[PDB]
Amino acid sequence: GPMAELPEGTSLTVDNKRFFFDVGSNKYGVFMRVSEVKPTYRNSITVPYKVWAKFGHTFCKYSEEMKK
Amino acid sequence: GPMAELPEGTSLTVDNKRFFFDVGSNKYGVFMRVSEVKPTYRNSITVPYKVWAKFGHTFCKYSEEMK
Ligand SMILES: [Cl-]
Ligand SMILES: [Cl-]
Ligand SMILES: [Cl-]
Ligand SMILES: [Cl-]
Ligand SMILES: [Cl-]
Ligand SMILES: [Cl-]
């Protein structure tokens, strides 16, 4: 059968904490799992495609607001 | 003790799911709590200030890539 392909996952690592961005797909559509990983701890939220750009804008605006 | 006013918390709502952005401060400094809420489900990650801009860029770059 034909192959579907999603974008490559990426990470952002700080001192002793790592964030993984992983794209997935289900009956509802395409989503982003954002996982936080520490030595004894893994936790994640899932974000539908339709709000990714608004997520991006939200983080950038909060970043600028507190600049510094 | 010394006090600082943080930015106002905001939300993004979709079908049967709500995201909350809440600024906090702990022993590691300022962080963003991102909460995902459903009628009987609530979970969150916490993101230190120093990677907010890179989180923003990551979401925007992935959004554009799906064309
Ligand atoms: Cl594809
Ligand atoms: Cl990843
Ligand atoms: Cl996934
Ligand atoms: Cl899911
Ligand atoms: Cl909020
Ligand atoms: Cl944590």
Author numbering:
A (entry chain B): 213 to 280
B (entry chain A): 213 to 279
What did the original publication write about this model?
Since Drosophila and human PURA have a rather moderate sequence identity of 46%, we decided to establish a better experimental basis for predicting the structural effects of patient-derived genetic variations and determined the crystal structure of the fragment P215-K280 (i.e. hsPURA III) at 1.7 Å resolution. The structure of the C-terminal PUR-domain possesses the typical four antiparallel β-strands and one α-helix. Like in the previously published dmPURA III structure, the C-terminal PUR domain of hsPURA is built from two PUR repeats III of independent protein chains that interact with each other to form an intermolecular homodimer. The hsPURA III dimer shows high structural similarity to dmPURA III with root mean square deviation (r.m.s.d.) of 1.26 Å for 125 superimposed Cα atoms and 50% of sequence identity. Analysis of the crystal structure of the hsPURA III homodimer revealed electrostatic surface potentials favorable for interactions with nucleic acids. When performing gel electrophoresis mobility shift assays (EMSAs) we indeed observed RNA binding. We indeed observed strand separation in presence of the hsPURA III fragment. F233 is part of the β-sheet and interacts with the α-helix of the other PUR repeat III within the PUR domain, contributing to dimerization. Since in the PURA F233del variant, one residue is deleted, the orientation of all subsequent amino acids in the β-strand adopt the opposite orientation, likely resulting in a fold disruption of the β-sheet and possibly in impaired dimerization. In the case of the R245P variant, the exchange into proline also likely impairs β-strand folding by introducing a kink, which could also impact dimerization.
